[PDB]
Amino acid sequence: QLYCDRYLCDKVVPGNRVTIMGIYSIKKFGLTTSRGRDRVGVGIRSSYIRVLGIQVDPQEEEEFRRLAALPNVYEVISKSIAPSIFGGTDMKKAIACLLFGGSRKRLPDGLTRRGDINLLMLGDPGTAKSQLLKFVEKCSPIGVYTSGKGSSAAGLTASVMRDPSSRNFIMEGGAMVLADGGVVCIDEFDKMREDDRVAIHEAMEQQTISIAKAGITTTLNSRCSVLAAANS
Amino acid sequence: VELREAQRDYLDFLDDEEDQGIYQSKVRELISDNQYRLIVNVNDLRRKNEKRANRLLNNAFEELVAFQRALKDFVASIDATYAKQYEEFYVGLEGSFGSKHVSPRTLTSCFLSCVVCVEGIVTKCSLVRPKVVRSVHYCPATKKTIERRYSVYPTKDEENNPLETEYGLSVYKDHQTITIQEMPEKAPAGQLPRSVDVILDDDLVDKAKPGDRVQVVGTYRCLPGKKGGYTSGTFRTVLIACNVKQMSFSAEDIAKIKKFSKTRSKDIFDQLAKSLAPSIHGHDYVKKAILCLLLGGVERDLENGSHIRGDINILLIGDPSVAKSQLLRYVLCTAPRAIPTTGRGSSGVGLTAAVTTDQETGERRLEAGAMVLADRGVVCIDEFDKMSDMDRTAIHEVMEQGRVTIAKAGIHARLNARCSVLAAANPVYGRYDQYKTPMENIGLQDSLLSRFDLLFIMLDQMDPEQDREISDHVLRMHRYRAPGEQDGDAMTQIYEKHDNLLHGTKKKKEKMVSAAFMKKYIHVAKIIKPVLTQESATYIAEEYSRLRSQDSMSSDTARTSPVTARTLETLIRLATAHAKARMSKTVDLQDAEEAVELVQYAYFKKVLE
Amino acid sequence: LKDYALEKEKVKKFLQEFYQDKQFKYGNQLVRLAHREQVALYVDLDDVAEDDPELVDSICENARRYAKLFADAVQELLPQYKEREVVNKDVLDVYIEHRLMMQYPAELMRRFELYFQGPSSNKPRVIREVRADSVGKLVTVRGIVTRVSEVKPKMVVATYTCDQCGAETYQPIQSPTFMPLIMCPSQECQTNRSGGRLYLQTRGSRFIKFQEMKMQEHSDQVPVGNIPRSITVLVEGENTRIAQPGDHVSVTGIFLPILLLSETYLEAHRIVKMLAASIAPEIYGHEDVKKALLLLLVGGVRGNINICLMGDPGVAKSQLLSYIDRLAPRSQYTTGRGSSGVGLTAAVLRDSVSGELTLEGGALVLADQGVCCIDEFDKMAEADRTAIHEVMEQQTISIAKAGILTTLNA
DNA sequence: GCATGCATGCGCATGCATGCAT
DNA sequence: ATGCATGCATGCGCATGCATGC
Ligand SMILES: Nc1ncnc2c1ncn2[C@@H]1O[C@H](COP(=O)(O)OP(=O)(O)O)[C@@H](O)[C@H]1O
Ligand SMILES: Nc1ncnc2c1ncn2[C@@H]1O[C@H](COP(=O)(O)OP(=O)(O)O)[C@@H](O)[C@H]1O
Ligand SMILES: Nc1ncnc2c1ncn2[C@@H]1O[C@H](COP(=O)(O)OP(=O)(O)O)[C@@H](O)[C@H]1O
Ligand SMILES: [Mg+2]
Ligand SMILES: [Mg+2]
Ligand SMILES: [Mg+2]
Ligand SMILES: [Zn+2]
């Protein structure tokens, strides 16, 4: 158990791998007689650690301007995309322009138009499709990789529940929700479930997901570029 | 000394009648309306006195007490007669706080004893409870009355004589507690939400309900550790509200509305339908139907308690990429109470209110559904074909009479569901087959179609001229950039200003209506209650008879929906809506002719070989 | 402030000088109350309007005090109108006679209850709008009853007998919970300092019927997008056994809290219930479809009748069912799966008073000796259809599941 | 036509915290 | 002054109802 004070609060999100330096101490709340069913333990005080340090596991502008000002930026970027994979120059260029992406535009009427690109790939097994998806996931600043049916311990789309104890609306971040402005790679496009398949239509079209349950109606934002692979 | 100076400054703030002030008129209105709460803009106070505003923001309780005292003195000076009823008045706050605009996630101890503004959703509410202010007791043995004030309950006299309580002579005030949770649309993904507790007193008790988005301005304070020889050193923080607002009218635009109506008259409906959505090209009949939904019909109740529906329902079917979802989103944006519910997004338990047994008290309570919340509103259903049959059966009752009947042993109720429905669905074959009859393509039961009022079929005909016009419009809209924004940057008049890209050189002869003026006019028209005339009734009846007898005059064309008794009500409702479109009092012939033309267009379609 | 003696005298003279109704009603009522031929008396505030109207406002503001004053005045007036002894006297009357033959609390010797009826000029309120401003006042509420508790006795005055003396000790009860006495406060025991211990007596003690009920708002008065609210009403005296679940009632009562937050409740004073083939004249045609409904409403001499109407959509079958539901005194209307399963038959639920389990019936149970209406019959579940068939053929429902083993009459 | 997956009420016991009647 | 009954989660075991998939 860890105790953080003052400015150390909210520096760590649950799930992070951390190295913490602190003081090993015990709780002090006076004295009290042992209670409960078990009274074998005598003179035992609960212990904790008081946290004191946490570690979580302008010049570049000119460099980027020089890189983009060349006449051969397109070829350099295309070659930079997966040099290990033989061939597929057009596919690499398409992947690069997908990574850069377009621009979204609003209108006075309030309607919005999509600014992200979606791609589909079909082919026989052994054409190195998963490798491209992994390279895109690693290269993109924000990237998610799924198997179509969700993942080991996370679904493809968000879900909403209500905690009976606290009566609060808890939302589980799905694969699409966890990415905002990034790239979502989807292998095995054929094996999608019905509800996820229905939701992905709205996710691709309006980049939003609408969920309505007892006493709640919400519209979450999912501005995700989609890169998909499927088999014959 | 400081409190007296603050009171003097607050008193000086209110006396603005000789300085173009409005607060005196506000106080007069409050006295007229029997209200004892005044809302003061923080921005105006900061403009007039920055030091007082800073002191109030950094120190709330003392400054608020001083301001309440100043308001008491001011109301006394105006009419001491009114001030006798209430002991003290209460203060409301409004404006832009800036750094103190704090979300539930960002609340910290740095804002203690300050005034903060929060925006959130309500999740927990408590029953209204009375709280004692003063107590009066009487002694039958000695015929003596005693008074106590609260800010120990006596039971016996000095000579141990019993005391009897006078409940009527006592003073009680309302009290309630609510919970506010951070909106999921703004909370980081994958993280648990955080909540705040708010206390409501006096007239603010019944201004919030669970599942609603509110904005609350109030003071932030700690609760002292309760009695005990040992303390843990941790205090609970609870917000004390002073103003609650439901997040969502002018004065001189009435003249503009009257002039526009008295001028255009007949052209009002055509202009409103034309300017519904510039971003979408074509589909005039669909826009007219959407405008009719926005206006709506007239609900009628009679002596026997019978109810006649006044809402309209429209179902759109067509090929992909014909701008149906765009229309649904536009209706969602424009309509005041609009709720989107996709096919498999919500089930029958979500669309319809349910019963849950409360573990705290052992009772059974009702939780409202999606359609229950949208009373006198619009519900949009995309991917309507994917919806299960049971959900359609549940929706049937709302579409028929707009009411929901619920009963689980120990409780039974009927809730109002007077709403309107937009539905978007795809053909069974993916794309609309021209040769096959509409019955095979739609693939829906006759009852569901009959309960719908209008059916529209949209086709993506690849005509070169239509394609050229659509491409022109789409690229003109895409090339547009908002004025005042630098090129390459990343991310009220009745008639809208002409734009070279949004409208075009040819469209200079005509103009589109502004959104705000359109909303105001729609609201005013919805207020109006038209009356049907005798001339139109016979015409409508004869045309209904002609429509029913058209079975022998249909030629090679087929009918999209069966013609039943509900079609006559649909005709009358569309006529009433079109009469509402232009501010009038009676139904005319052209009013029924428009609805007849709409029915002619909607109900019959040619079949290609 | 004002002296209560003058107002008590005014009440006494009002109870004796209201001939303007021609027979003296209050004289007869007092005679019946004195001869134990009547156990309840109701006072009309509209009748008081002939006298000074200030009394009406005072009662509307401090109802309990004036109720006690009226009770005391009636008790004092009772001896004057007595003419004869009790013809047939019960156990309590025997105790009263023996005690008089040989201070006693006023309510112990008292054997009548008084109630107030709200003025007709007083407009009925809404359950949502009763708040702290109405605490301690007299209000009128219209609603629908949803839950009713069983009748049980409740103590009023407790009687204790000493271990070493014949003296009887009396203790009034004005709280939901009370502390029993131990030592004997009798003068004999006080002088001798014997320290005898008291014992409770059930025969000498006084009990009154007690009942709980709940009310809900009408669907018409519910605001936009809200849910009907519920209120709790306490029933005592002869008002017991009047209200039943599913009935539309109007109750006149007092708004009182319970112990600086508090919980509120209502104390009831008056509870009230709210060719010929012209069924639904709004619907054209169907001349031969309306006599069948009339015969269904009339019924046979088992003589029950069941009717089913199958039709194409748009011929307005639902409106006829709604009209039948509205016309019948005891009626229930079902739309579909919104009242399936537990909605019909019955379920077991906790009690508010006893703290144990009791059976609450569904729509079919409420519609006993009435008419039930079902819409979209083909869409019902198999279990519901079997239950409906059982009701039609046998008129009783048999339930045998974990914790439930019952046969309900329908 | 039925067994099973997924909520949800029911009844219960068990553990942790605290607040004061004898 | 001190030890205990109670309010508030939480696991346990169970039955019951709604949806669907072969
Ligand atoms: N054109 C290629 N250049 C280099 N390696 C390749 C190429 N095609 C296939 N491979 C190799 O073969 C393997 C293909 O497996 P994988 O990419 O998972 O197939 P798929 O994605 O189609 O299921 C990869 O590990 C990759 O190293
Ligand atoms: N008539 C039209 N005018 C302008 N844009 C159109 C038109 N028809 C289609 N579009 C464009 O094509 C896209 C269609 O997507 P969407 O509205 O989701 O189609 P649907 O609702 O039929 O599934 C929209 O983004 C819209 O900008
Ligand atoms: N014979 C008739 N006379 C008058 N109105 C009718 C008649 N038949 C149908 N209607 C109208 O048509 C509508 C039918 O709706 P509804 O009662 O829900 O039909 P159903 O009960 O068959 O589902 C009603 O609102 C009613 O006003
Ligand atoms: Mg692969
Ligand atoms: Mg669409
Ligand atoms: Mg019907
Ligand atoms: Zn004794």
Asked whether A44 and A26 are in contact (CB, 8 A), the reply is: no
Chains in contact with B, counting 3 or more C-beta pairs less than 8 Å apart as contact: A, C
Q: Is B360 left (phi over 0), alpha (psi -120 to 50) or beta?
A: alpha
E strand or H helix at B123, and its extent?
strand B115-125
Cα–Cα distance measured from residue B374 to residue B355, given in angstroms and rounded to the nearest whole number: 19
Residue B498 is given by DSSP the state P
Q: Could you tell me whether strands B236-246 and B195-201 are parallel, antiparallel, or unpaired per DSSP bridges?
A: parallel
Residues by CB within 7 A of strand E: list them: A 33, 165; B 347-348, 388, 390; C 337, 340-342, 381, 383, 401-403
Q: Which residues line ligand 2 (CB under 6 A)?
A: A 113, 205; B 280-282, 320-326, 470, 473-474
Q: Going by CA atoms, what residue is nearest to atom 13 of ligand 2?
A: B321
Structure tokens at B227: 């009695």
Buried/exposed code over C299-322 (b: 16+ C-beta within 10 A; e: otherwise) = eeeeeeeeeeeeeebbbbbbbbbb
Contact, C302 CB vs strand D, < 7 Å: no
Can you state the angle between helices B2-14 and B50-58, rounded to 10 degrees? Answer: 120
Does C245 reach chain B within 8 Å, measured CB to CB?
A: no
Rg, Å, chain C Cα set:
27
Q: B386 to chain A, minimum CA–CA distance in Å?
A: 8
Asked whether B83 and B72 are in contact (CB, 8 A), the reply is: yes
The amino acid sitting at A83 is P
Give Cα separations from B302 to B307, B400, C281, C282 (angstroms).
7, 17, 12, 10
Give Cα separations from A18 to A11, A56, C392 (angstroms).
11, 5, 71
What's C247-283 look like in SS3? CEEEEEEEEEEECCECEEEEEEEEEEECCCCCCCCCC
Asked whether C282 and C170 are in contact (CB, 8 A), the reply is: no
Q: A197 to chain B, minimum CA–CA distance in Å?
A: 10
Cα–Cα distance measured from residue C231 to residue B128, given in angstroms and rounded to the nearest whole number: 12
Shortest CA distance to C150 belongs to which of C237, C211, C209?
A: C211
Cα–Cα distance measured from residue C45 to residue C49, given in angstroms and rounded to the nearest whole number: 7
Structure tokens at B58: 């950094």
Indicate the length of chain A as a whole number: 232
E strand or H helix at B179, and its extent?
strand B171-181
Q: Could you tell me whether strands B115-125 and B171-181 are parallel, antiparallel, or unpaired per DSSP bridges?
A: antiparallel
Cα–Cα distance measured from residue B44 to residue B229, given in angstroms and rounded to the nearest whole number: 48
Q: Do the chains contact at A214 and B195, CB–CB below 8 Å?
A: no
Does B366 reach chain A within 8 Å, measured CB to CB?
A: no
Shortest CA distance to A95 belongs to which of A227, A7, A212?
A: A227
| Residues preceding chain discontinuities in chain A with C to N over 2.5 Å | 57
Asked whether C168 and C208 are in contact (CB, 8 A), the reply is: no
The reported resolution of this PDB entry, expressed in Å, is 3.2
Count the neighbouring beta carbons within 10 Å of the beta carbon of residue A212. Answer: 24
**Residues 6+ positions from C275 with CB-CB distance below 8 Å:** none
Cα–Cα distance measured from residue A208 to residue B28, given in angstroms and rounded to the nearest whole number: 48
Asked whether C137 and C261 are in contact (CB, 8 A), the reply is: no
Report the structure determination method. Answer: cryo-EM
**Residues 6+ positions from B121 with CB-CB distance below 8 Å:** A169, A216, B180, B181, B182, B183, B211, B212, B213, B214
Give how far the C-alpha of residue B574 lies from the chain's centroid of Cα atoms, to the nearest Å: 24
Cα–Cα distance measured from residue A103 to residue A114, given in angstroms and rounded to the nearest whole number: 8
Which bases of chain E are under 7 A from a protein CB atom?
A: 3, 9-10, 15-20
Maximum pairwise Cα distance, chain B: 107
Query: How buried is residue A33: exposed, middle or buried, by Cβ count under 10 Å (0-12/13-18/19+)?
Result: exposed
Long-range contacts (CB closer than 8 Å, 24 or more residues apart) made by C242-247: C242/C271, C242/C273, C243/C145, C243/C148, C243/C213, C243/C271, C244/C145, C244/C148, C245/C145, C245/C146, C245/C147, C245/C148, C245/C360, C245/C366, C246/B412, C246/C144, C246/C145, C246/C146, C246/C330, C246/C332, C246/C366, C247/C144, C247/C145, C247/C273
Asked whether A209 and A222 are in contact (CB, 8 A), the reply is: yes
Asked whether A160 and A171 are in contact (CB, 8 A), the reply is: yes
Query: How buried is residue C59: exposed, middle or buried, by Cβ count under 10 Å (0-12/13-18/19+)?
Result: buried
Residue A129 Cα to ligand 4 midpoint, Å, equals: 6
Consult the annotation and say whether B326 binds a ligand.
yes
Paired with C348 in beta bridges are C359
Give Cα separations from A7 to A56, B108, B187 (angstroms).
16, 11, 21
Rounded to 5°, the CA angle C17-C21-C22 comes to 100
E strand or H helix at B403, and its extent?
strand B403-408
Indicate the length of chain C as a whole number: 410
Give Cα separations from B292 to B310, B458, B573 (angstroms).
12, 19, 9
Backbone angles phi, psi at A163, to 5 degrees: -75, 120
Asked whether B387 and B448 are in contact (CB, 8 A), the reply is: no
Cα–Cα distance measured from residue C40 to residue B399, given in angstroms and rounded to the nearest whole number: 51
Cβ–ligand 3 distance for C284 under 6 Å, the answer yes
Cα–Cα distance measured from residue B524 to residue B272, given in angstroms and rounded to the nearest whole number: 14
Asked whether C363 and C344 are in contact (CB, 8 A), the reply is: yes
User: Which of B372, B406, B451 is closest, CB to CB, to C339?
Assistant: B406
Can you state the angle between helices B284-295 and B515-527, rounded to 10 degrees? Answer: 50
Shortest CA distance to B128 belongs to which of B171, B197, B175, B180?
A: B175
Structure tokens at B331: 């209706």
Asked whether C332 and C290 are in contact (CB, 8 A), the reply is: no
Q: Going by CA atoms, what residue is nearest to atom 12 of ligand 2?
A: B321
Backbone angles phi, psi at C194, to 5 degrees: -70, -30
The three-class DSSP label of residue B54 is: helix
Rounded to 5°, the CA angle B169-B137-B162 comes to 145
The nucleotide closest to B388 (CA, C1' atoms): E19
Cα–Cα distance measured from residue C297 to residue C290, given in angstroms and rounded to the nearest whole number: 11
Across the A:B interface, residue pairs with CB atoms under 8 Å apart total 121
- B482 contact residues in A (CB cutoff 8 A): 108
Which residues 19-48 in chain A show a CB within 8 A of chain B? 29-30
Asked whether C255 and C139 are in contact (CB, 8 A), the reply is: yes
Cβ–ligand 1 distance for A85 under 6 Å, the answer yes
Q: Where are the alpha helices (DSSP H) in B15-153?
A: 23-32, 42-48, 50-58, 61-83
Shortest CA distance to C59 belongs to which of C77, C75, C45, C41?
A: C45
DSSP-assigned letters across all residues of C97-154: HHHHH----HHHH---EEEEE--TTS--B-GGG--GGGTTSEEEEEEEEEEEPPPEEE
Shortest CA distance to B455 belongs to which of B564, B565, B598?
A: B598
The amino acid sitting at C277 is A
Cα–Cα distance measured from residue B79 to residue B138, given in angstroms and rounded to the nearest whole number: 34
DSSP-assigned letters across all residues of chain A: -EE--GGGTTS--TT--EEEEEEEEE---------SS-----S---EEEEEEEEEE--HHHHHHHHHHTSTTHHHHHHHHS-TTS-S-HHHHHHHHHHHH----EE-TTS-EE----EEEEE--TTS--HHHHHHHHHHSSSEEEE-SS--SS--SS-EEEE-TTT--EEEE--HHHH-SSSEEEES-GGG--HHHHHHHHHHHHTSEEEEEETTEEEEEE---EEEEEE--
Q: Evaluate the CA torsion angle C20, C23, C24, C30 in order and state its sign.
A: negative
Cβ–ligand 1 distance for A83 under 6 Å, the answer no
Give Cα separations from C105 to B222, B426, C89, C180 (angstroms).
51, 81, 21, 17
Residue B132 is given by DSSP the state E
DSSP-assigned letters across all residues of B224-265: PPPS-SS--S--EEEEEEEEEEE----STHHHHHHHHHHHHT
Q: Could you tell me whether strands C138-148 and C168-172 are parallel, antiparallel, or unpaired per DSSP bridges?
A: unpaired
Which bases of chain D are under 7 A from a protein CB atom?
A: 8-11, 14-16, 18-20
Cα–Cα distance measured from residue B319 to residue B458, given in angstroms and rounded to the nearest whole number: 7
Q: Going by CA atoms, what residue is nearest to atom 16 of ligand 3?
A: C316
Shortest CA distance to A175 belongs to which of A148, A201, A194, A205?
A: A148
The amino acid sitting at B279 is S
Give Cα separations from B178 to A167, B124, B214, B239 (angstroms).
12, 6, 11, 10
Tokens 């906790």, residue located: C350
The amino acid sitting at A88 is G
- A167 contact residues in B (CB cutoff 8 A): 123-124, 179
Query: How buried is residue B142: exposed, middle or buried, by Cβ count under 10 Å (0-12/13-18/19+)?
Result: exposed
Cβ–ligand 3 distance for C283 under 6 Å, the answer yes
Q: Could you tell me whether strands B90-94 and C40-44 are parallel, antiparallel, or unpaired per DSSP bridges?
A: unpaired
Cα–Cα distance measured from residue B129 to residue C297, given in angstroms and rounded to the nearest whole number: 46
Cα–Cα distance measured from residue B266 to residue B262, given in angstroms and rounded to the nearest whole number: 10
Q: Is A88 left (phi over 0), alpha (psi -120 to 50) or beta?
A: left
Tokens 């429905």, residue located: B421
Structure tokens at B45: 């106070």
Asked whether B117 and B147 are in contact (CB, 8 A), the reply is: no
**Residues 6+ positions from C96 with CB-CB distance below 8 Å:** C109, C111
Tokens 């005690």, residue located: C99
Backbone angles phi, psi at B361, to 5 degrees: -115, -10
Tokens 């992406």, residue located: A101
Shortest CA distance to C210 belongs to which of C156, C264, C135?
A: C156
Paired with B197 in beta bridges are B179
Shortest CA distance to B296 belongs to which of B310, B316, B315?
A: B310
Shortest CA distance to B144 belongs to which of C71, C4, C137?
A: C4
Cα–Cα distance measured from residue A25 to residue B357, given in angstroms and rounded to the nearest whole number: 45
Q: C223 to chain B, minimum CA–CA distance in Å?
A: 9
Count the neighbouring beta carbons within 10 Å of the beta carbon of residue B34. Answer: 8
Indicate the length of chain B as a whole number: 609
**Residues 6+ positions from B6 with CB-CB distance below 8 Å:** B52, B55, B62, B63, B66
**Residues 6+ positions from A37 with CB-CB distance below 8 Å:** none
Buried/exposed code over B410-446 (b: 16+ C-beta within 10 A; e: otherwise) = bbbbbbbbbbbbbbbbbbeeeebeeeeebeebbebee
Cα–Cα distance measured from residue B291 to residue C226, given in angstroms and rounded to the nearest whole number: 28
